[PDB]
Structure 1
Amino acid sequence: HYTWPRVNDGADWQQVRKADNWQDNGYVGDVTSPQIRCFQATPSPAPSVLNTTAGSTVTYWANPDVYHPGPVQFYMARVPDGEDINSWNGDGAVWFKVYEDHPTFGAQLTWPSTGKSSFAVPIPPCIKSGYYLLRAEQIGLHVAQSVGGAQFYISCAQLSVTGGGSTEPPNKVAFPGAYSATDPGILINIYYPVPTSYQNPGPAVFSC
Structure 2
Amino acid sequence: HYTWPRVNDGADWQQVRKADNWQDNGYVGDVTSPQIRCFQATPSPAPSVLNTTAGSTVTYWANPDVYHPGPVQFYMARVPDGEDINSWNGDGAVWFKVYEDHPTFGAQLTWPSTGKSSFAVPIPPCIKSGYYLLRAEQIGLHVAQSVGGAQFYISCAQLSVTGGGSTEPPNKVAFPGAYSATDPGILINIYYPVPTSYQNPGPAVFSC
Helix, strand or coil at the partner of 1:36: helix
Residue 53 of structure 1 deviates from its aligned partner by 0.1
**What is the rounded CA distance, in whole Å, between the counterparts of 1:107 and 1:48 in structure 2?**
45
Residues 145-204 of structure 1: CA distance to partner in whole angstroms, max 9, x if unpaired?
Answer: 000000000000000000000000000000000000000000000000000000000000
Helix, strand or coil at the partner of 1:131: strand
**What is the rounded CA distance, in whole Å, between the counterparts of 1:206 and 1:30 in structure 2?**
25
Residues 102-146 of structure 1: CA distance to partner in whole angstroms, max 9, x if unpaired?
Answer: 000000000000000000000000000000000000000000000
**What is the rounded CA distance, in whole Å, between the counterparts of 2:61 and 2:106 in structure 1?**
28
Helix, strand or coil at the partner of 1:132: strand
**What is the rounded CA distance, in whole Å, between the counterparts of 1:91 and 1:99 in structure 2?**
21
**What is the rounded CA distance, in whole Å, between the counterparts of 1:8 and 1:207 in structure 2?**
22
**What is the rounded CA distance, in whole Å, between the counterparts of 2:127 and 2:196 in structure 1?**
34
Paired position in structure 2 for 1:17: 17
**What is the rounded CA distance, in whole Å, between the counterparts of 2:11 and 2:202 in structure 1?**
30
Residue 21 of structure 1 deviates from its aligned partner by 0.1
**What is the rounded CA distance, in whole Å, between the counterparts of 1:144 and 1:178 in structure 2?**
18
Residues 7-29 of structure 1: CA distance to partner in whole angstroms, max 9, x if unpaired?
Answer: 00000000000000000000000
**What is the rounded CA distance, in whole Å, between the counterparts of 2:91 and 2:182 in structure 1?**
23
**What is the rounded CA distance, in whole Å, between the counterparts of 1:83 and 1:191 in structure 2?**
46
Helix, strand or coil at the partner of 1:76: strand
Paired position in structure 1 for 2:165: 165
| Equivalent pairs, count | 208
Residues 48-85 of structure 1: CA distance to partner in whole angstroms, max 9, x if unpaired?
Answer: 00000000000000000000000000000000000000
Where in structure 1 are there 5+ consecutive unaligned residues? none
Where in structure 2 are there 5+ consecutive unaligned residues? none
**What is the rounded CA distance, in whole Å, between the counterparts of 1:14 and 1:51 in structure 2?**
13
- TM-score, normalisation: structure 1: 1.00
1:1-208 superposed matches below 5 A:
1-208=1-208
Helix, strand or coil at the partner of 1:155: strand
Helix, strand or coil at the partner of 2:37: helix
Helix, strand or coil at the partner of 2:36: helix
Helix, strand or coil at the partner of 1:31: coil
